[PDB]
Design a protein around this motif. Structure first.
Motif, PDB file in Angstrom:
ATOM      1  N   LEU A 144     -29.984  45.822  -8.287  1.00  0.00           N
ATOM      2  CA  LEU A 144     -29.386  44.921  -9.291  1.00  0.00           C
ATOM      3  C   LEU A 144     -30.317  44.771 -10.458  1.00  0.00           C
ATOM      4  CD1 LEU A 144     -27.756  42.123  -7.252  1.00  0.00           C
ATOM      5  CD2 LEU A 144     -26.623  43.911  -8.600  1.00  0.00           C
ATOM      6  N   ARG A 145     -31.610  44.788 -10.182  1.00  0.00           N
ATOM      7  CA  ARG A 145     -32.592  44.722 -11.278  1.00  0.00           C
ATOM      8  C   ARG A 145     -32.452  45.936 -12.188  1.00  0.00           C
ATOM      9  NH1 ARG A 145     -35.727  41.440 -14.587  1.00  0.00           N
ATOM     10  NH2 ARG A 145     -37.862  42.262 -14.809  1.00  0.00           N
ATOM     11  N   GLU A 146     -32.308  47.104 -11.578  1.00  0.00           N
ATOM     12  CA  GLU A 146     -32.139  48.348 -12.347  1.00  0.00           C
ATOM     13  C   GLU A 146     -30.863  48.272 -13.167  1.00  0.00           C
ATOM     14  OE1 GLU A 146     -32.592  51.663  -9.586  1.00  0.00           O
ATOM     15  OE2 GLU A 146     -34.723  51.184  -9.345  1.00  0.00           O
ATOM     16  N   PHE A 147     -29.768  47.827 -12.553  1.00  0.00           N
ATOM     17  CA  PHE A 147     -28.524  47.576 -13.295  1.00  0.00           C
ATOM     18  C   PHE A 147     -28.742  46.696 -14.517  1.00  0.00           C
ATOM     19  CE2 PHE A 147     -24.771  44.722 -13.868  1.00  0.00           C
ATOM     20  CZ  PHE A 147     -23.870  45.670 -14.375  1.00  0.00           C
ATOM     21  N   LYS A 148     -29.368  45.539 -14.312  1.00  0.00           N
ATOM     22  CA  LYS A 148     -29.564  44.570 -15.388  1.00  0.00           C
ATOM     23  C   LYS A 148     -30.447  45.160 -16.495  1.00  0.00           C
ATOM     24  CE  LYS A 148     -31.958  39.943 -15.730  1.00  0.00           C
ATOM     25  NZ  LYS A 148     -32.518  38.804 -14.874  1.00  0.00           N
ATOM     26  N   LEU A 149     -31.557  45.794 -16.111  1.00  0.00           N
ATOM     27  CA  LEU A 149     -32.527  46.301 -17.134  1.00  0.00           C
ATOM     28  C   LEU A 149     -32.018  47.559 -17.841  1.00  0.00           C
ATOM     29  CD1 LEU A 149     -35.922  45.672 -15.385  1.00  0.00           C
ATOM     30  CD2 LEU A 149     -34.866  44.319 -17.194  1.00  0.00           C
ATOM     31  N   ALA A 150     -31.210  48.358 -17.135  1.00  0.00           N
ATOM     32  CA  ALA A 150     -30.701  49.625 -17.710  1.00  0.00           C
ATOM     33  C   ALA A 150     -29.841  49.290 -18.910  1.00  0.00           C
ATOM     34  CB  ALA A 150     -29.867  50.420 -16.720  1.00  0.00           C
ATOM     35  N   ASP A 151     -29.082  48.201 -18.812  1.00  0.00           N
ATOM     36  CA  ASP A 151     -28.191  47.745 -19.905  1.00  0.00           C
ATOM     37  C   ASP A 151     -27.374  48.949 -20.460  1.00  0.00           C
ATOM     38  OD1 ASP A 151     -26.984  46.350 -21.944  1.00  0.00           O
ATOM     39  OD2 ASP A 151     -28.740  46.363 -23.261  1.00  0.00           O
ATOM     40  N   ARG A 152     -26.741  49.655 -19.526  1.00  0.00           N
ATOM     41  CA  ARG A 152     -26.028  50.894 -19.811  1.00  0.00           C
ATOM     42  C   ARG A 152     -24.607  50.807 -19.253  1.00  0.00           C
ATOM     43  NH1 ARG A 152     -22.886  54.146 -20.317  1.00  0.00           N
ATOM     44  NH2 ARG A 152     -22.817  52.796 -22.194  1.00  0.00           N
ATOM     45  N   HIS A 153     -24.478  50.919 -17.932  1.00  0.00           N
ATOM     46  CA  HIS A 153     -23.191  50.790 -17.230  1.00  0.00           C
ATOM     47  C   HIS A 153     -22.699  49.373 -17.285  1.00  0.00           C
ATOM     48  CE1 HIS A 153     -23.015  54.846 -15.579  1.00  0.00           C
ATOM     49  NE2 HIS A 153     -24.342  54.765 -15.375  1.00  0.00           N
ATOM     50  N   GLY A 154     -21.382  49.199 -17.482  1.00  0.00           N
ATOM     51  CA  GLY A 154     -20.763  47.884 -17.665  1.00  0.00           C
ATOM     52  C   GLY A 154     -20.307  47.184 -16.394  1.00  0.00           C
ATOM     53  N   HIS A 155     -20.371  47.890 -15.263  1.00  0.00           N
ATOM     54  CA  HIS A 155     -20.103  47.206 -13.989  1.00  0.00           C
ATOM     55  C   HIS A 155     -20.732  47.951 -12.865  1.00  0.00           C
ATOM     56  CE1 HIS A 155     -17.038  50.321 -13.564  1.00  0.00           C
ATOM     57  NE2 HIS A 155     -16.872  49.967 -12.279  1.00  0.00           N
ATOM     58  N   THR A 156     -20.827  47.277 -11.719  1.00  0.00           N
ATOM     59  CA  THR A 156     -21.347  47.913 -10.488  1.00  0.00           C
ATOM     60  C   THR A 156     -20.835  47.130  -9.272  1.00  0.00           C
ATOM     61  OG1 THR A 156     -23.315  48.914  -9.467  1.00  0.00           O
ATOM     62  CG2 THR A 156     -23.583  46.625 -10.245  1.00  0.00           C
ATOM     63  N   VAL A 157     -20.906  47.742  -8.089  1.00  0.00           N
ATOM     64  CA  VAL A 157     -20.383  47.100  -6.895  1.00  0.00           C
ATOM     65  C   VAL A 157     -21.399  47.265  -5.773  1.00  0.00           C
ATOM     66  CG1 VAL A 157     -18.365  46.835  -5.380  1.00  0.00           C
ATOM     67  CG2 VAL A 157     -18.062  47.870  -7.609  1.00  0.00           C
ATOM     68  N   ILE A 158     -21.613  46.187  -5.015  1.00  0.00           N
ATOM     69  CA  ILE A 158     -22.376  46.296  -3.776  1.00  0.00           C
ATOM     70  C   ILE A 158     -21.340  46.174  -2.661  1.00  0.00           C
ATOM     71  CG2 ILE A 158     -24.176  45.364  -2.271  1.00  0.00           C
ATOM     72  CD1 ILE A 158     -25.421  44.120  -4.887  1.00  0.00           C
ATOM     73  N   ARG A 159     -21.262  47.214  -1.831  1.00  0.00           N
ATOM     74  CA  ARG A 159     -20.212  47.383  -0.840  1.00  0.00           C
ATOM     75  C   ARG A 159     -20.778  47.217   0.563  1.00  0.00           C
ATOM     76  NH1 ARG A 159     -15.804  49.240  -3.403  1.00  0.00           N
ATOM     77  NH2 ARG A 159     -16.077  50.440  -5.352  1.00  0.00           N
ATOM     78  N   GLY A 160     -19.948  46.726   1.486  1.00  0.00           N
ATOM     79  CA  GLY A 160     -20.256  46.773   2.930  1.00  0.00           C
ATOM     80  C   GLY A 160     -20.896  45.517   3.468  1.00  0.00           C
ATOM     81  N   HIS A 161     -20.702  44.373   2.799  1.00  0.00           N
ATOM     82  CA  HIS A 161     -21.199  43.109   3.369  1.00  0.00           C
ATOM     83  C   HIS A 161     -20.365  42.759   4.575  1.00  0.00           C
ATOM     84  CE1 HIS A 161     -22.399  42.685  -0.957  1.00  0.00           C
ATOM     85  NE2 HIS A 161     -23.417  41.957  -0.500  1.00  0.00           N
ATOM     86  N   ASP A 162     -20.952  41.994   5.497  1.00  0.00           N
ATOM     87  CA  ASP A 162     -20.239  41.461   6.658  1.00  0.00           C
ATOM     88  C   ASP A 162     -19.810  40.019   6.357  1.00  0.00           C
ATOM     89  OD1 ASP A 162     -19.374  40.524   9.147  1.00  0.00           O
ATOM     90  OD2 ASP A 162     -21.252  41.059  10.178  1.00  0.00           O
ATOM     91  N   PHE A 163     -18.538  39.855   6.042  1.00  0.00           N
ATOM     92  CA  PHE A 163     -17.942  38.541   5.806  1.00  0.00           C
ATOM     93  C   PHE A 163     -17.076  38.235   7.028  1.00  0.00           C
ATOM     94  CE2 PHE A 163     -17.813  39.289   0.874  1.00  0.00           C
ATOM     95  CZ  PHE A 163     -19.190  39.066   0.814  1.00  0.00           C
ATOM     96  N   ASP A 164     -17.646  37.449   7.962  1.00  0.00           N
ATOM     97  CA  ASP A 164     -17.030  37.125   9.284  1.00  0.00           C
ATOM     98  C   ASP A 164     -15.674  36.443   9.100  1.00  0.00           C
ATOM     99  OD1 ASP A 164     -16.354  35.917  11.772  1.00  0.00           O
ATOM    100  OD2 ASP A 164     -18.454  35.416  12.203  1.00  0.00           O
TER     101      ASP A 164
END
Lengths: 314, 332
Positions: free
Chosen positions: B52-72
């Motif tokens: 997420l830090r790389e996402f924020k600092l890159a200031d390039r791509h306009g969205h991203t997704v973190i996939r595969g959390h366990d939501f019981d």
């Protein structure tokens, strides 16, 4: 004005952390270090993190100090004759890293490409090359001026203070406050590298008239640099309100000492600051501070930064 | 578009952290929780913080997704019929805490005073009585794409959308700007102050000088109708603020009209469907992407799609003039 005094255990933990990091990373030329900064700052003693977080979120006091750091005087070595042409980083890299960690708790470190060779951490020490005493908001004119400044005292053998002053609102009339909130004041400034310099000078700099007070009318932020501030002659209300504000800030100025091992945090929206003349010895034992500028929003200055990745404006 | 898929090990570590924090803190009403967020966020798996830090600092791509959390799903329980009147915090407090941790890695969570009781983490799920509304609590209505609060100087810098459940895989739409698709002349026009962007109704000031002052800047915008740019930042990779419904291109400004239409076509054609399925957290850069939602038929039986949403600001103090106190994170 709250302050936090490190226990010896905290001081040791901070010193050990900064030594580890200095050995692990090359310099600030390491993009990985700049990436890692906030996560690395979370390895600081929790009380220190909590203290600075409270200062940032309180948005009340104009400055604070963390006292009692262990800055190893032998390792740091003699105060240099100059910053220019000096190899970077020196043996004081751990202390610079400390300030960069602190900058990551408050926002993002950034710098000015035309100041001290574009180093993110600036040096403040006497250089051999009547004095009016002055104070100001840092870069009051600039839309992307620092939100905070961090000043780390590597050494201060004669206890030379820094001047800091906040705004006591109770001294001002409601009327003068409203005028100070209106856009009635002029604040003056201080290769595609050559093209960018000229673009920055034009692009914004020739901005319109602006306010001196902003934010909440009950507890205002300020941008106040008396030397570079002027008021249109005809605007007598704005001149009167400006005179009143000057007198209140000038009369409230305090001297704050940052002694060896102190880190002074200045909120550049709530406090003005200045320096005090002092006799140096020029013998490698003189006062030496380090200085990091902090922005809350690095993206806001994109138009003045050469790349998305650079933290240098200009 | 980069994304991060959690290993089961990472997903387990995130789930246990959020359950630990849920037990340790009361609610978001705890000012101490809000103080602690960035320090607590540093307890997330290192790989996630780095991504997420790389996402924020890159200031390039306009969205991203973190996939595969366990939501019981058994713990979270049925999708509520309304956000009003719920026991707070709910059994999904760990997932709300997760989004708050992610928000602290990007900036500061903040909200709007008049919206969902001022909660910092909003609910998105279908509400029967809202079926004929173009809101987040809707379903049947097409939410077309826009920058969030394009007119507002203190609009969100990022949005975070966490999918607690999405059994029919209903997509979010996200669109970025492919700059190579525009002419240099059009880009120059888009960077100039030539466009009027109107406020959403919910922001309209239409009792006390203190109240009036909280809306004076927005009121001035309504009264003076300043023109402004649609693109800003760097000319080689610009930020954008595009809400077509609220944008007026002045009739006489032929160049502005030409450049607006070209911008609209590029963004409209580049729209993609992103599914935020159960366990996905979608991050939107509100300066680089527009977003919207697709219509879908709700069942209204406790099984419907349920997202949580947090708005993120990079500079909370900038909005002080519109905040009742220094401490509040709510505008208005």
């Amino acid at each position: 004005t709250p302050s936090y005094s490190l226990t010896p255990a905290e001081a040791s933990a901070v010193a050990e952390l900064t030594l580890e990091l200095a050995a692990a990373y090359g310099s600030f030329g390491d993009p990985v270090l700049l990436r890692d900064l906030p996560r690395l700052a979370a390895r600081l003693p929790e009380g220190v993190q909590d203290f600075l977080r409270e200062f940032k979120l309180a948005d009340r006091h104009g400055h604070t100090v963390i006292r009692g750091h262990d800055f190893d005087q032998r390792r740091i070595g003699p105060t240099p004759d100059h910053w220019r042409g000096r190899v970077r980083p020196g043996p004081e890299f751990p202390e610079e890293l400390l300030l960069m960690l602190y900058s990551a708790l408050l926002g993002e470190p950034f710098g000015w490409a035309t100041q001290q060779d574009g180093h993110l951490v600036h040096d403040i020490f006497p250089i051999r090359s009547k004095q009016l005493l002055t104070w100001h908001t840092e870069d009051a004119f600039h839309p992307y001026r620092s939100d905070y400044l961090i000043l780390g005292a590597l050494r201060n053998p004669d206890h030379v203070p820094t001047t800091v002053g906040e705004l006591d609102l109770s001294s001002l009339s409601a009327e003068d406050i409203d005028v100070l909130f209106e856009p009635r004041y002029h604040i003056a400034p201080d290769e595609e590298e050559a093209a960018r310099f000229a673009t920055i000078q034009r692009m914004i700099d020739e901005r319109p008239l602006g306010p001196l007070l902003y934010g909440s009318r009950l507890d205002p932020y300020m941008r106040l640099d008396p030397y570079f501030t002027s008021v249109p002659q005809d605007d007598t209300d704005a001149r009167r309100a400006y005179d009143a504000l000057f007198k209140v800030v000038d009369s409230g100025m305090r001297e704050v000492v940052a002694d060896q091992g102190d880190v002074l945090f200045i909120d550049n929206h709530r406090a003005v600051h200045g320096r005090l003349p002092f006799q140096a010895r020029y013998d490698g034992t003189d006062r030496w501070l380090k200085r990091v500028c902090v922005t809350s929003d690095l993206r806001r200055s994109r138009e003045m930064r050469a790349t998305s990745a650079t933290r240098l404006l200009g």
